[PDB]
């Protein structure tokens, strides 16, 4: 169905421990496909999915140069940020950027993204219009003024409507065996008595891709959202993900509870129960 491509930058200063580190990772949906780390050998953009290995030397040279240039640019940006927030050169700080595009089933742009953070807080964001900016504070407003003056939004829009979607479409075709395959969750409910009076029912979802999933417990048909323990969806290490949802239920009432599972790989939402 719908797909995304996102690049994620992390630039981290470390006073007394050399120049700021710059890392880029690229994803299509929940699949890492390229990485760059300025602390490497030998820093280069490196493939992390088989389908990107098809790209020729020109691709890799260009992608590496972009990242090597960015390493320098973001060191400058970290120095500028100190000035914008009246901070000393003694402390460690982080700039992050995430940008990319979503496409629909027909491959057309659904929306574009470009957003930055400083020390884990929103800094500046390209608006959905791909023409204006939202600055989080008076520091980011200085950057906004610079970017408005240079018509940066217009350049980004050109990329997001063009190369972003064009390359993503190519990746989806080259990786169609995996990127265009949903793996539904394998599901089961486990039973763990806490006491004579109460038991834990845990609804498991394993081996699914992509990561998006909904697990919900109902008691007599009513969602138990406030009373459910939901763990963060977690990577298995084989591309797939795992998740569980747990409720504490009175002993002898287990059959009043039903777990409901929604995932792209399922033809319809699934309902399951404790099966002793």
């Amino acid at each position: 169905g719908s797909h995304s491509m996102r690049y994620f930058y992390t630039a981290m200063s470390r006073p007394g421990r050399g120049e700021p580190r710059f890392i880029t990772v690229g994803y299509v949906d929940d699949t890492l496909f390229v990485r760059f780390d300025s602390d490497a050998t030998s820093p280069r953009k490196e493939p992390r999915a088989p389908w990107i290995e098809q790209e020729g030397p020109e691709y890799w040279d260009r992608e590496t140069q972009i990242s090597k240039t960015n390493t320098q640019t973001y060191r400058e940006n970290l120095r500028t940020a100190l000035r914008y927030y009246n901070q000393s050169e003694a402390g460690s700080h982080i700039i992050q950027r995430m940008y990319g595009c979503d496409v629909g089933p027909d491959g057309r742009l659904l929306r574009g993204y470009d957003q930055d953070a400083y020390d884990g807080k929103d800094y500046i964001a390209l608006n959905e219009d791909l023409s204006s900016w939202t600055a989080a504070d008076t520091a980011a407003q200085i950057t906004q003024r610079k970017w408005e003056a240079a018509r940066v939004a217009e350049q980004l829009r050109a990329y997001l409507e063009g190369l972003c979607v064009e390359s993503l479409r190519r990746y989806l075709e080259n990786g169609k065996e995996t990127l265009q395959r949903a793996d539904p969750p394998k599901t089961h409910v486990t039973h763990h008595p806490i006491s004579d009076h109460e038991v834990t029912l845990r609804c498991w979802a394993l081996g699914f891709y992509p990561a998006e999933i909904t697990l919900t417990w109902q008691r007599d048909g009513e969602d138990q959202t406030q009373d459910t323990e939901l763990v963060e969806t977690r990577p298995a290490g084989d591309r797939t993900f795992q998740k569980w949802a747990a409720v504490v239920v009175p002993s002898g009432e287990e059959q009043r509870y039903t777990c409901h599972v929604q995932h792209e790989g399922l033809p319809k939402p699934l309902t399951l129960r404790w099966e002793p």
Binding site: Y7, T24, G26, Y59, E63, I66, S67, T69, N70, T73, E76, N77, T80, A81, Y84, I95, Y99, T143, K146, W147, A150, V152, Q155, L156, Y159, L163, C164, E166, S167
Partner: peptide, 10 residues
């Protein structure tokens, strides 16, 4: 494929 925006600085 990445974008490179020349001269874009904070």
């Amino acid at each position: 494929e990445e974008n490179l925006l020349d001269f874009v600085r904070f």
